[PDB]
Amino acid sequence: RTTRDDLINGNSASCADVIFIYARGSTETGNLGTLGPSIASNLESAFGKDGVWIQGVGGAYRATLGDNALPRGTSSAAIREMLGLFQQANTKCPDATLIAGGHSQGAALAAASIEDLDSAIRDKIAGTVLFGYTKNLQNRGRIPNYPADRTKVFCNTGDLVCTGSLIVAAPHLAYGPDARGPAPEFLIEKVRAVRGS
């Protein structure tokens, strides 16, 4: 299932304990793309289906390849869309622990959104995973205004976008194993560090 709108569709009277907001890569389908579904099923296994809400960044985020060249690595409209989702999560489910992630253009989108977010909401994101982070070199492997201990970057050797380029090479399409294992492992660990059991 490449489309998940658990936060938008979810009942505020029965909020999940964990809300995961994910931005897909360039030209990918639905709002989860290629890696999102793998991360989602593993999160569901850990917290249960009613324990976690999976929400992809859709709407105005069209994941247009050309937008990788814009100043922030994505469009202003897309940043507005993701910011809106974090805000919706914060108002709809005040007590939920948030987690985020993004691949390729979506990783730049996640970094830009998190950087602009009001600190009170940003501080609720227990962990963020970034694959093929297009702003990896420029941001020195960090997300501005966000702690390094809550951030995990997956940048393959040979994935040119991780070294300051916008060229798409084979390693950029090889994050499958990370999405199936270490990425969700990191997210679950970070949620448990603050929520306990």
Side-chain angles (χ1 to χ4, degrees), residues 10-61:
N11 273 96
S12 62
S14 42
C15 279
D17 288 337
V18 180
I19 302 171
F20 177 58
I21 300 168
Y22 181 83
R24 73 194 185 284
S26 301
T27 326
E28 297 191 337
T29 61
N31 62 8
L32 293 183
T34 63
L35 307 180
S38 293
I39 302 173
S41 66
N42 284 295
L43 289 181
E44 291 171 356
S45 291
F47 306 112
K49 181 263 193 180
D50 302 297
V52 61
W53 278 354
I54 308 299
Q55 174 65 237
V57 179
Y61 179 42

mmCIF file of all heavy atoms in Angstrom, residues 10-61:
data_model
loop_
_atom_site.group_PDB
_atom_site.id
_atom_site.type_symbol
_atom_site.label_atom_id
_atom_site.label_comp_id
_atom_site.label_asym_id
_atom_site.label_seq_id
_atom_site.Cartn_x
_atom_site.Cartn_y
_atom_site.Cartn_z
ATOM 1 N N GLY A 10 -7.655 9.397 10.727
ATOM 2 C CA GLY A 10 -7.813 8.980 12.106
ATOM 3 C C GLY A 10 -8.728 9.764 13.017
ATOM 4 O O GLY A 10 -8.823 10.985 12.945
ATOM 5 N N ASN A 11 -9.365 9.040 13.931
ATOM 6 C CA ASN A 11 -10.256 9.652 14.917
ATOM 7 C C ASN A 11 -9.469 10.245 16.062
ATOM 8 O O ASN A 11 -8.772 9.501 16.756
ATOM 9 C CB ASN A 11 -11.195 8.608 15.491
ATOM 10 C CG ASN A 11 -12.424 8.438 14.665
ATOM 11 O OD1 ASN A 11 -12.493 7.539 13.831
ATOM 12 N ND2 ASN A 11 -13.396 9.328 14.855
ATOM 13 N N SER A 12 -9.622 11.549 16.314
ATOM 14 C CA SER A 12 -8.894 12.200 17.409
ATOM 15 C C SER A 12 -9.291 11.627 18.771
ATOM 16 O O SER A 12 -8.565 11.785 19.752
ATOM 17 C CB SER A 12 -9.102 13.716 17.392
ATOM 18 O OG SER A 12 -10.467 14.031 17.589
ATOM 19 N N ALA A 13 -10.459 10.997 18.846
ATOM 20 C CA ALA A 13 -10.875 10.395 20.107
ATOM 21 C C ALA A 13 -10.081 9.115 20.367
ATOM 22 O O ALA A 13 -10.018 8.643 21.497
ATOM 23 C CB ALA A 13 -12.370 10.099 20.105
ATOM 24 N N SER A 14 -9.489 8.544 19.327
ATOM 25 C CA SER A 14 -8.705 7.335 19.494
ATOM 26 C C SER A 14 -7.331 7.466 18.825
ATOM 27 O O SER A 14 -6.951 6.691 17.947
ATOM 28 C CB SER A 14 -9.481 6.118 18.991
ATOM 29 O OG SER A 14 -10.160 6.395 17.785
ATOM 30 N N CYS A 15 -6.583 8.452 19.281
ATOM 31 C CA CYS A 15 -5.250 8.720 18.762
ATOM 32 C C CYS A 15 -4.280 7.584 19.020
ATOM 33 O O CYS A 15 -4.312 6.963 20.080
ATOM 34 C CB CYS A 15 -4.691 9.963 19.440
ATOM 35 S SG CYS A 15 -5.262 11.534 18.740
ATOM 36 N N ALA A 16 -3.398 7.330 18.054
ATOM 37 C CA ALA A 16 -2.355 6.312 18.207
ATOM 38 C C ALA A 16 -1.294 6.926 19.130
ATOM 39 O O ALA A 16 -1.263 8.148 19.321
ATOM 40 C CB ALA A 16 -1.739 6.006 16.861
ATOM 41 N N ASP A 17 -0.429 6.094 19.698
ATOM 42 C CA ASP A 17 0.641 6.578 20.581
ATOM 43 C C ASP A 17 1.823 7.122 19.784
ATOM 44 O O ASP A 17 2.619 7.917 20.292
ATOM 45 C CB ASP A 17 1.174 5.437 21.454
ATOM 46 C CG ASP A 17 0.189 5.013 22.548
ATOM 47 O OD1 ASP A 17 -0.685 5.823 22.923
ATOM 48 O OD2 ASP A 17 0.305 3.869 23.042
ATOM 49 N N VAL A 18 1.954 6.638 18.555
ATOM 50 C CA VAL A 18 3.065 7.017 17.695
ATOM 51 C C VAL A 18 2.541 7.415 16.317
ATOM 52 O O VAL A 18 1.706 6.711 15.734
ATOM 53 C CB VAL A 18 4.033 5.812 17.521
ATOM 54 C CG1 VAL A 18 5.208 6.190 16.608
ATOM 55 C CG2 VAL A 18 4.523 5.289 18.900
ATOM 56 N N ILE A 19 3.033 8.536 15.799
ATOM 57 C CA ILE A 19 2.628 9.005 14.480
ATOM 58 C C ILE A 19 3.889 9.163 13.641
ATOM 59 O O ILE A 19 4.803 9.903 14.026
ATOM 60 C CB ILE A 19 1.854 10.343 14.549
ATOM 61 C CG1 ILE A 19 0.615 10.161 15.431
ATOM 62 C CG2 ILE A 19 1.425 10.792 13.138
ATOM 63 C CD1 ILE A 19 -0.109 11.449 15.759
ATOM 64 N N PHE A 20 3.921 8.464 12.509
ATOM 65 C CA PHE A 20 5.062 8.499 11.596
ATOM 66 C C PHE A 20 4.690 9.263 10.322
ATOM 67 O O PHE A 20 3.730 8.905 9.626
ATOM 68 C CB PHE A 20 5.469 7.070 11.263
ATOM 69 C CG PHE A 20 6.587 6.964 10.264
ATOM 70 C CD1 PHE A 20 7.823 7.558 10.507
ATOM 71 C CD2 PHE A 20 6.408 6.233 9.086
ATOM 72 C CE1 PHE A 20 8.883 7.421 9.589
ATOM 73 C CE2 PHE A 20 7.453 6.097 8.173
ATOM 74 C CZ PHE A 20 8.690 6.694 8.435
ATOM 75 N N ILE A 21 5.448 10.310 10.017
ATOM 76 C CA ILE A 21 5.189 11.136 8.833
ATOM 77 C C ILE A 21 6.375 10.959 7.901
ATOM 78 O O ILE A 21 7.519 11.251 8.278
ATOM 79 C CB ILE A 21 5.002 12.594 9.228
ATOM 80 C CG1 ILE A 21 3.801 12.699 10.178
ATOM 81 C CG2 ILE A 21 4.787 13.442 7.998
ATOM 82 C CD1 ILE A 21 3.670 14.024 10.860
ATOM 83 N N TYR A 22 6.089 10.503 6.682
ATOM 84 C CA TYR A 22 7.134 10.178 5.723
ATOM 85 C C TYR A 22 6.999 10.854 4.366
ATOM 86 O O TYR A 22 5.898 10.906 3.809
ATOM 87 C CB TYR A 22 7.108 8.662 5.530
ATOM 88 C CG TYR A 22 8.148 8.134 4.582
ATOM 89 C CD1 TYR A 22 9.451 7.885 5.018
ATOM 90 C CD2 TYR A 22 7.842 7.909 3.236
ATOM 91 C CE1 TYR A 22 10.436 7.427 4.131
ATOM 92 C CE2 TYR A 22 8.820 7.446 2.346
ATOM 93 C CZ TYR A 22 10.112 7.215 2.807
ATOM 94 O OH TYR A 22 11.096 6.804 1.934
ATOM 95 N N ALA A 23 8.117 11.322 3.813
ATOM 96 C CA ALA A 23 8.117 11.963 2.475
ATOM 97 C C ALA A 23 8.863 11.058 1.483
ATOM 98 O O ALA A 23 10.024 10.700 1.700
ATOM 99 C CB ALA A 23 8.771 13.345 2.521
ATOM 100 N N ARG A 24 8.205 10.731 0.372
ATOM 101 C CA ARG A 24 8.756 9.853 -0.646
ATOM 102 C C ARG A 24 9.811 10.523 -1.525
ATOM 103 O O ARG A 24 10.008 11.753 -1.481
ATOM 104 C CB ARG A 24 7.619 9.307 -1.537
ATOM 105 C CG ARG A 24 7.004 10.332 -2.512
ATOM 106 C CD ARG A 24 5.679 9.826 -3.096
ATOM 107 N NE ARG A 24 5.127 10.717 -4.115
ATOM 108 C CZ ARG A 24 4.517 11.877 -3.870
ATOM 109 N NH1 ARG A 24 4.368 12.326 -2.625
ATOM 110 N NH2 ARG A 24 4.050 12.596 -4.880
ATOM 111 N N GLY A 25 10.466 9.702 -2.343
ATOM 112 C CA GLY A 25 11.482 10.205 -3.247
ATOM 113 C C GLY A 25 10.909 10.760 -4.549
ATOM 114 O O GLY A 25 9.705 10.673 -4.806
ATOM 115 N N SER A 26 11.789 11.300 -5.389
ATOM 116 C CA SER A 26 11.371 11.875 -6.656
ATOM 117 C C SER A 26 10.672 10.885 -7.584
ATOM 118 O O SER A 26 11.124 9.752 -7.746
ATOM 119 C CB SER A 26 12.578 12.490 -7.376
ATOM 120 O OG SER A 26 13.202 13.496 -6.607
ATOM 121 N N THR A 27 9.560 11.330 -8.165
ATOM 122 C CA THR A 27 8.782 10.547 -9.123
ATOM 123 C C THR A 27 8.130 9.286 -8.558
ATOM 124 O O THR A 27 7.601 8.466 -9.311
ATOM 125 C CB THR A 27 9.660 10.155 -10.378
ATOM 126 O OG1 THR A 27 10.606 11.192 -10.669
ATOM 127 C CG2 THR A 27 8.784 9.972 -11.611
ATOM 128 N N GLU A 28 8.169 9.110 -7.248
ATOM 129 C CA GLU A 28 7.574 7.923 -6.645
ATOM 130 C C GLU A 28 6.049 8.031 -6.525
ATOM 131 O O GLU A 28 5.500 9.132 -6.547
ATOM 132 C CB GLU A 28 8.241 7.617 -5.310
ATOM 133 C CG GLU A 28 9.720 7.289 -5.481
ATOM 134 C CD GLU A 28 10.355 6.724 -4.236
ATOM 135 O OE1 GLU A 28 9.837 6.951 -3.119
ATOM 136 O OE2 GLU A 28 11.388 6.046 -4.367
ATOM 137 N N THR A 29 5.380 6.896 -6.368
ATOM 138 C CA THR A 29 3.923 6.861 -6.328
ATOM 139 C C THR A 29 3.271 6.942 -4.961
ATOM 140 O O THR A 29 3.930 6.748 -3.938
ATOM 141 C CB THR A 29 3.421 5.598 -7.018
ATOM 142 O OG1 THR A 29 3.931 4.452 -6.322
ATOM 143 C CG2 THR A 29 3.919 5.558 -8.451
ATOM 144 N N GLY A 30 1.964 7.207 -4.961
ATOM 145 C CA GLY A 30 1.197 7.302 -3.730
ATOM 146 C C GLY A 30 1.825 8.391 -2.896
ATOM 147 O O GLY A 30 2.265 9.400 -3.448
ATOM 148 N N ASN A 31 1.833 8.224 -1.577
ATOM 149 C CA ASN A 31 2.490 9.202 -0.720
ATOM 150 C C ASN A 31 3.585 8.537 0.120
ATOM 151 O O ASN A 31 4.241 9.186 0.942
ATOM 152 C CB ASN A 31 1.496 10.034 0.131
ATOM 153 C CG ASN A 31 0.659 9.196 1.106
ATOM 154 O OD1 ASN A 31 0.889 8.003 1.296
ATOM 155 N ND2 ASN A 31 -0.343 9.837 1.715
ATOM 156 N N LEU A 32 3.814 7.247 -0.129
ATOM 157 C CA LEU A 32 4.863 6.505 0.566
ATOM 158 C C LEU A 32 5.995 6.055 -0.370
ATOM 159 O O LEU A 32 7.106 5.751 0.086
ATOM 160 C CB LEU A 32 4.284 5.295 1.316
ATOM 161 C CG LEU A 32 3.356 5.613 2.495
ATOM 162 C CD1 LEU A 32 2.964 4.277 3.140
ATOM 163 C CD2 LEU A 32 4.053 6.523 3.516
ATOM 164 N N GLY A 33 5.727 5.999 -1.670
ATOM 165 C CA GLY A 33 6.770 5.587 -2.592
ATOM 166 C C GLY A 33 7.338 4.175 -2.417
ATOM 167 O O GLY A 33 6.639 3.241 -1.986
ATOM 168 N N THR A 34 8.635 4.025 -2.694
ATOM 169 C CA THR A 34 9.272 2.720 -2.636
ATOM 170 C C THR A 34 9.714 2.179 -1.278
ATOM 171 O O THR A 34 9.633 0.980 -1.051
ATOM 172 C CB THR A 34 10.493 2.649 -3.598
ATOM 173 O OG1 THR A 34 11.483 3.596 -3.175
ATOM 174 C CG2 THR A 34 10.082 2.979 -5.042
ATOM 175 N N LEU A 35 10.210 3.042 -0.392
ATOM 176 C CA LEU A 35 10.711 2.600 0.913
ATOM 177 C C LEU A 35 9.701 2.681 2.073
ATOM 178 O O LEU A 35 9.753 1.886 3.015
ATOM 179 C CB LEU A 35 11.948 3.430 1.283
ATOM 180 C CG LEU A 35 13.061 3.479 0.246
ATOM 181 C CD1 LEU A 35 14.209 4.347 0.753
ATOM 182 C CD2 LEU A 35 13.527 2.046 -0.031
ATOM 183 N N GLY A 36 8.803 3.660 1.994
ATOM 184 C CA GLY A 36 7.820 3.870 3.034
ATOM 185 C C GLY A 36 7.028 2.649 3.466
ATOM 186 O O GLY A 36 6.908 2.414 4.668
ATOM 187 N N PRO A 37 6.480 1.849 2.532
ATOM 188 C CA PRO A 37 5.703 0.671 2.944
ATOM 189 C C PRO A 37 6.477 -0.321 3.812
ATOM 190 O O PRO A 37 5.924 -0.865 4.774
ATOM 191 C CB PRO A 37 5.254 0.077 1.610
ATOM 192 C CG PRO A 37 5.151 1.306 0.720
ATOM 193 C CD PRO A 37 6.433 2.021 1.069
ATOM 194 N N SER A 38 7.759 -0.513 3.512
ATOM 195 C CA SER A 38 8.598 -1.429 4.285
ATOM 196 C C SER A 38 8.777 -0.934 5.708
ATOM 197 O O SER A 38 8.738 -1.721 6.660
ATOM 198 C CB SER A 38 9.978 -1.567 3.628
ATOM 199 O OG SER A 38 9.851 -2.211 2.376
ATOM 200 N N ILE A 39 9.001 0.368 5.848
ATOM 201 C CA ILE A 39 9.196 0.941 7.169
ATOM 202 C C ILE A 39 7.877 0.810 7.924
ATOM 203 O O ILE A 39 7.847 0.343 9.068
ATOM 204 C CB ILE A 39 9.606 2.434 7.114
ATOM 205 C CG1 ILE A 39 10.901 2.611 6.301
ATOM 206 C CG2 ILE A 39 9.832 2.958 8.536
ATOM 207 C CD1 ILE A 39 11.285 4.086 6.056
ATOM 208 N N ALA A 40 6.787 1.144 7.245
ATOM 209 C CA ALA A 40 5.473 1.090 7.858
ATOM 210 C C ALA A 40 5.094 -0.274 8.429
ATOM 211 O O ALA A 40 4.652 -0.348 9.577
ATOM 212 C CB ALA A 40 4.391 1.605 6.884
ATOM 213 N N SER A 41 5.275 -1.349 7.665
ATOM 214 C CA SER A 41 4.900 -2.669 8.182
ATOM 215 C C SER A 41 5.692 -3.073 9.424
ATOM 216 O O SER A 41 5.155 -3.724 10.330
ATOM 217 C CB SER A 41 5.035 -3.737 7.107
ATOM 218 O OG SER A 41 6.392 -3.896 6.762
ATOM 219 N N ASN A 42 6.960 -2.669 9.488
ATOM 220 C CA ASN A 42 7.780 -3.000 10.651
ATOM 221 C C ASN A 42 7.381 -2.193 11.874
ATOM 222 O O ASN A 42 7.480 -2.673 13.000
ATOM 223 C CB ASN A 42 9.263 -2.834 10.342
ATOM 224 C CG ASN A 42 9.797 -3.960 9.501
ATOM 225 O OD1 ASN A 42 9.826 -5.105 9.943
ATOM 226 N ND2 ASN A 42 10.153 -3.663 8.253
ATOM 227 N N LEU A 43 6.920 -0.971 11.659
ATOM 228 C CA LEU A 43 6.475 -0.141 12.768
ATOM 229 C C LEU A 43 5.177 -0.754 13.294
ATOM 230 O O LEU A 43 4.946 -0.796 14.502
ATOM 231 C CB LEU A 43 6.223 1.306 12.314
ATOM 232 C CG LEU A 43 7.448 2.153 11.953
ATOM 233 C CD1 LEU A 43 7.025 3.563 11.560
ATOM 234 C CD2 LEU A 43 8.388 2.204 13.142
ATOM 235 N N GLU A 44 4.317 -1.201 12.384
ATOM 236 C CA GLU A 44 3.048 -1.810 12.781
ATOM 237 C C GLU A 44 3.297 -3.076 13.602
ATOM 238 O O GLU A 44 2.574 -3.362 14.559
ATOM 239 C CB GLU A 44 2.179 -2.124 11.556
ATOM 240 C CG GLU A 44 1.633 -0.894 10.840
ATOM 241 C CD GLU A 44 0.970 -1.235 9.513
ATOM 242 O OE1 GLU A 44 0.984 -2.410 9.091
ATOM 243 O OE2 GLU A 44 0.439 -0.318 8.874
ATOM 244 N N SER A 45 4.332 -3.819 13.256
ATOM 245 C CA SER A 45 4.639 -5.031 13.996
ATOM 246 C C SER A 45 5.045 -4.714 15.416
ATOM 247 O O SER A 45 4.663 -5.416 16.347
ATOM 248 C CB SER A 45 5.764 -5.797 13.318
ATOM 249 O OG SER A 45 5.319 -6.336 12.093
ATOM 250 N N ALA A 46 5.810 -3.639 15.579
ATOM 251 C CA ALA A 46 6.292 -3.251 16.894
ATOM 252 C C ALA A 46 5.271 -2.619 17.815
ATOM 253 O O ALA A 46 5.279 -2.900 19.019
ATOM 254 C CB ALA A 46 7.501 -2.325 16.766
ATOM 255 N N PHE A 47 4.431 -1.739 17.282
ATOM 256 C CA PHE A 47 3.470 -1.029 18.123
ATOM 257 C C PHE A 47 2.039 -1.491 17.956
ATOM 258 O O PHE A 47 1.158 -1.052 18.690
ATOM 259 C CB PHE A 47 3.537 0.477 17.828
ATOM 260 C CG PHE A 47 4.909 1.055 17.937
ATOM 261 C CD1 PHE A 47 5.576 1.507 16.794
ATOM 262 C CD2 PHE A 47 5.546 1.145 19.175
ATOM 263 C CE1 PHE A 47 6.865 2.044 16.879
ATOM 264 C CE2 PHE A 47 6.845 1.684 19.277
ATOM 265 C CZ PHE A 47 7.504 2.134 18.122
ATOM 266 N N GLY A 48 1.805 -2.329 16.956
ATOM 267 C CA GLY A 48 0.466 -2.805 16.671
ATOM 268 C C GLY A 48 -0.200 -1.864 15.683
ATOM 269 O O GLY A 48 0.186 -0.699 15.584
ATOM 270 N N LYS A 49 -1.228 -2.338 14.984
ATOM 271 C CA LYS A 49 -1.914 -1.516 13.998
ATOM 272 C C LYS A 49 -2.624 -0.285 14.577
ATOM 273 O O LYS A 49 -2.687 0.755 13.924
ATOM 274 C CB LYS A 49 -2.849 -2.379 13.152
ATOM 275 C CG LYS A 49 -3.613 -1.646 12.056
ATOM 276 C CD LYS A 49 -5.034 -1.256 12.494
ATOM 277 C CE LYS A 49 -5.898 -0.802 11.304
ATOM 278 N NZ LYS A 49 -7.289 -0.416 11.736
ATOM 279 N N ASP A 50 -3.176 -0.384 15.779
ATOM 280 C CA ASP A 50 -3.817 0.788 16.350
ATOM 281 C C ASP A 50 -2.833 1.575 17.215
ATOM 282 O O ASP A 50 -3.196 2.617 17.780
ATOM 283 C CB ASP A 50 -5.051 0.396 17.175
ATOM 284 C CG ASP A 50 -6.101 -0.368 16.358
ATOM 285 O OD1 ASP A 50 -6.660 0.205 15.390
ATOM 286 O OD2 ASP A 50 -6.339 -1.556 16.684
ATOM 287 N N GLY A 51 -1.595 1.092 17.302
ATOM 288 C CA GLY A 51 -0.593 1.771 18.101
ATOM 289 C C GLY A 51 0.210 2.808 17.329
ATOM 290 O O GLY A 51 0.837 3.691 17.930
ATOM 291 N N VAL A 52 0.161 2.734 16.004
ATOM 292 C CA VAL A 52 0.910 3.663 15.173
ATOM 293 C C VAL A 52 0.129 4.095 13.934
ATOM 294 O O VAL A 52 -0.584 3.297 13.321
ATOM 295 C CB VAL A 52 2.283 3.056 14.754
ATOM 296 C CG1 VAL A 52 2.090 1.765 13.941
ATOM 297 C CG2 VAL A 52 3.095 4.067 13.958
ATOM 298 N N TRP A 53 0.189 5.389 13.639
ATOM 299 C CA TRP A 53 -0.473 5.936 12.467
ATOM 300 C C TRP A 53 0.616 6.280 11.450
ATOM 301 O O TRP A 53 1.605 6.945 11.785
ATOM 302 C CB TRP A 53 -1.243 7.206 12.819
ATOM 303 C CG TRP A 53 -2.612 6.970 13.423
ATOM 304 C CD1 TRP A 53 -3.251 5.775 13.580
ATOM 305 C CD2 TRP A 53 -3.505 7.976 13.905
ATOM 306 N NE1 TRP A 53 -4.497 5.974 14.134
ATOM 307 C CE2 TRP A 53 -4.679 7.318 14.349
ATOM 308 C CE3 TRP A 53 -3.437 9.371 14.018
ATOM 309 C CZ2 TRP A 53 -5.775 8.009 14.883
ATOM 310 C CZ3 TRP A 53 -4.523 10.062 14.549
ATOM 311 C CH2 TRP A 53 -5.675 9.376 14.981
ATOM 312 N N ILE A 54 0.454 5.777 10.232
ATOM 313 C CA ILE A 54 1.394 6.019 9.144
ATOM 314 C C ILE A 54 0.759 7.085 8.258
ATOM 315 O O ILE A 54 -0.375 6.910 7.777
ATOM 316 C CB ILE A 54 1.576 4.757 8.259
ATOM 317 C CG1 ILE A 54 1.934 3.520 9.109
ATOM 318 C CG2 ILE A 54 2.586 5.044 7.152
ATOM 319 C CD1 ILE A 54 3.236 3.643 9.898
ATOM 320 N N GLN A 55 1.497 8.159 7.995
ATOM 321 C CA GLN A 55 0.986 9.253 7.166
ATOM 322 C C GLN A 55 2.031 9.713 6.155
ATOM 323 O O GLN A 55 3.070 10.229 6.549
ATOM 324 C CB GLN A 55 0.594 10.453 8.062
ATOM 325 C CG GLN A 55 0.192 11.711 7.277
ATOM 326 C CD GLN A 55 -1.076 11.502 6.470
ATOM 327 O OE1 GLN A 55 -1.102 11.676 5.243
ATOM 328 N NE2 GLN A 55 -2.136 11.095 7.157
ATOM 329 N N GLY A 56 1.754 9.541 4.865
ATOM 330 C CA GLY A 56 2.689 9.996 3.861
ATOM 331 C C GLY A 56 2.405 11.460 3.563
ATOM 332 O O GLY A 56 1.337 11.977 3.898
ATOM 333 N N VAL A 57 3.372 12.146 2.970
ATOM 334 C CA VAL A 57 3.214 13.547 2.618
ATOM 335 C C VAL A 57 2.709 13.603 1.176
ATOM 336 O O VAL A 57 3.462 13.347 0.218
ATOM 337 C CB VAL A 57 4.537 14.330 2.752
ATOM 338 C CG1 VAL A 57 4.323 15.786 2.361
ATOM 339 C CG2 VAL A 57 5.074 14.231 4.199
ATOM 340 N N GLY A 58 1.421 13.894 1.027
ATOM 341 C CA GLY A 58 0.823 13.962 -0.296
ATOM 342 C C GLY A 58 0.466 15.394 -0.628
ATOM 343 O O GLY A 58 1.291 16.302 -0.500
ATOM 344 N N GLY A 59 -0.784 15.600 -1.037
ATOM 345 C CA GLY A 59 -1.262 16.934 -1.351
ATOM 346 C C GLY A 59 -0.422 17.673 -2.374
ATOM 347 O O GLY A 59 -0.259 17.220 -3.504
ATOM 348 N N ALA A 60 0.154 18.786 -1.937
ATOM 349 C CA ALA A 60 0.988 19.644 -2.778
ATOM 350 C C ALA A 60 2.364 19.079 -3.080
ATOM 351 O O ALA A 60 3.056 19.602 -3.945
ATOM 352 C CB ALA A 60 1.145 21.028 -2.136
ATOM 353 N N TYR A 61 2.799 18.074 -2.330
ATOM 354 C CA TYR A 61 4.113 17.484 -2.587
ATOM 355 C C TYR A 61 3.974 16.505 -3.755
ATOM 356 O O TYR A 61 3.491 15.375 -3.592
ATOM 357 C CB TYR A 61 4.660 16.765 -1.345
ATOM 358 C CG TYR A 61 6.012 16.116 -1.578
ATOM 359 C CD1 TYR A 61 7.004 16.786 -2.297
ATOM 360 C CD2 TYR A 61 6.288 14.830 -1.106
ATOM 361 C CE1 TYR A 61 8.241 16.187 -2.547
ATOM 362 C CE2 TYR A 61 7.515 14.217 -1.349
ATOM 363 C CZ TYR A 61 8.496 14.910 -2.070
ATOM 364 O OH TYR A 61 9.739 14.343 -2.313
#
